[PDB]
Curated annotation (Swiss-Prot):
<feature type="binding site">
    <location>
        <position position="5"/>
    </location>
    <ligand>
        <name>substrate</name>
    </ligand>
</feature>
<feature type="binding site">
    <location>
        <position position="72"/>
    </location>
    <ligand>
        <name>NADP(+)</name>
    </ligand>
</feature>
<feature type="binding site">
    <location>
        <position position="53"/>
    </location>
    <ligand>
        <name>substrate</name>
    </ligand>
</feature>
<feature type="binding site">
    <location>
        <begin position="41"/>
        <end position="42"/>
    </location>
    <ligand>
        <name>NADP(+)</name>
    </ligand>
</feature>
<dbReference type="GO" id="GO:0005829">
    <property type="term" value="C:cytosol"/>
</dbReference>
<dbReference type="GO" id="GO:0046654">
    <property type="term" value="P:tetrahydrofolate biosynthetic process"/>
</dbReference>
<dbReference type="GO" id="GO:0031427">
    <property type="term" value="P:response to methotrexate"/>
</dbReference>
<dbReference type="GO" id="GO:0046677">
    <property type="term" value="P:response to antibiotic"/>
</dbReference>
<comment type="function">
    <text>Key enzyme in folate metabolism. Catalyzes an essential reaction for de novo glycine and purine synthesis, and for DNA precursor synthesis.</text>
</comment>
<dbReference type="GO" id="GO:0009410">
    <property type="term" value="P:response to xenobiotic stimulus"/>
</dbReference>
<dbReference type="GO" id="GO:0005542">
    <property type="term" value="F:folic acid binding"/>
</dbReference>
<dbReference type="GO" id="GO:0051870">
    <property type="term" value="F:methotrexate binding"/>
</dbReference>
<dbReference type="GO" id="GO:0046452">
    <property type="term" value="P:dihydrofolate metabolic process"/>
</dbReference>
<feature type="domain" description="DHFR">
    <location>
        <begin position="1"/>
        <end position="154"/>
    </location>
</feature>
<keyword id="KW-0560">Oxidoreductase</keyword>
<dbReference type="GO" id="GO:0050661">
    <property type="term" value="F:NADP binding"/>
</dbReference>
<dbReference type="GO" id="GO:0070402">
    <property type="term" value="F:NADPH binding"/>
</dbReference>
């Protein structure tokens, strides 16, 4: 099954005006040993394959890096994962919009930061997604903002 994972600021802004090592531990635990699907802009932003994971990059043009697996469509990305329990889509905004209708699980980090960004998470509605887990953490000496881990399953 497909799951989206992302860190959302106010107004669902994504993509780094914060410094959250605790969110990176949450991201690493939830994606480790699972294939990750990302768009090309996300891929160039990270700049390196996420270790311990099959990296699948969506792009309409031929691949330019043999360290990862390149695909040209959503169906081809899903097929490139094979038979795995859970597929993790990690961004960006354009890729999230295509995978939201097919996802059954949302891993969200709600960051209490006002950021004027030009990329947003899709507008998921409460009647389609039911919160099954929530965990707030205050801002501390290592995390620049307060944040809230949430897991939503399709109701
Ligand atoms: N390093 C960077 O380039 C970079 C990093 C961060 C942000 N930005 C900017 O910030 C904005 C954020 O964009 P984003 O986060 O929404 O990007 P994204 O989802 O991470 O990547 C979108 C790209 O993925 C490819 N793609 C997505 N779906 C596809 C499909 N079904 N079939 C084939 N290819 C597909 C396309 O690349 P192709 O163009 O190859 O088709 C598309 O341009 C972008 O407008 C960008 O200009 C750029
Ligand atoms: Ca709806």
């Amino acid at each position: 099954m497909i799951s989206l994972i992302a860190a959302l600021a106010v107004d669902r802004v994504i993509g780094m005006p914060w410094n959250l090592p605790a969110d990176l531990a949450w991201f690493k635990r939830n994606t480790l040993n699972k294939p990750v699907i990302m768009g090309r802009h996300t891929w160039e932003s990270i700049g390196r394959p996420l270790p311990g994971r099959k990296n699948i990059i969506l792009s309409s043009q031929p691949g330019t890096d043999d360290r990862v697996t390149w695909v040209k469509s959503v169906d081809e990305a899903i097929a490139a994962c094979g038979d795995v329990p859970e597929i993790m889509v990690i961004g960006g905004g354009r890729v999230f919009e295509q995978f939201l209708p097919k996802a059954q699980k949302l891993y969200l980090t709600h960051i209490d930061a006002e950021v004027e960004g030009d990329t947003h998470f899709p507008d998921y509605e409460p009647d389609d997604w039911e919160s099954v887990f929530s965990e707030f953490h205050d801002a501390d000496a290592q995390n620049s903002h307060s944040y809230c881990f949430e897991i939503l399953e399709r109701r």
